[PDB]
Amino acid sequence: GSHSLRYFVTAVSRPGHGKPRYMEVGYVDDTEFVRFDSDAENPRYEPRTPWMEQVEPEYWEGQTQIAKGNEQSSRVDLRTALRYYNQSAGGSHTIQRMRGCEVGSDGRLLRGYQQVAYDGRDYIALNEDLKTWTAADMAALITKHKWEQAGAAERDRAYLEGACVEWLRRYLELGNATLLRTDSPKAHVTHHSRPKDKVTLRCWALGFYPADITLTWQLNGEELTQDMELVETRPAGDGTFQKWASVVVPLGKEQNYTCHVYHEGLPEPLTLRW
């Protein structure tokens, strides 16, 4: 498996009173490990897993610094945004950013990226080529020309191939004995009566890490989706995940339906039958 280091950042202009809040969250392989949060009095980056607490005192000094920088720019970006879109003056708005790296297990960069969204929608995104931008709309074109003029693209490209890789690799080593673990899902099928002589079979997957999984119901013919409800993968809140997938069957015909669970923490894929 490849791995990622991603930062997800949010700026929210509060209506009348308040100033913008600002939040900076970073994730190694989709596990949170550092957070920064504007509302605190003691606004500081902080460890979010046990293995980041082991880190050189001045790591934080450094990261906190950058956060205040970015915080300040956010305030300004929000005001800029407002003027690009000619928006009514009184409302609550949002700027969000994501950037990070996925690198293979051989240690080479796979994809680097950085995207901004305004009020929940795509604004601008660095292209996979790491040197051209994609504007989502006419306001973002203003920024794109700014960033083209400011050589922004080169600075991000340098960080993505530079600091992020180096640090990704370095965070893995730190919490190496946890982010690499693999818990396999425990599955069962439940049964439920239904109006008209219909039956909900529901296929459960519990206790798995990492989150990625595939639950499918096959009517002995491999393919099945028509009338097949499944929920988004959800955290059980102990480090593991949960998911289920249900299907409705004519009463009497339960045995014809098999559930299949694919997950990387399994010797081999489970099949289940009521």
Binding site: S73, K146, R155, Y159, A163
Partner: peptide, 8 residues
């Protein structure tokens, strides 16, 4: 580690 973000 995170970096500085360009202003939009």
């Amino acid at each position: 580690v995170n970096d500085i973000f360009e202003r939009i």
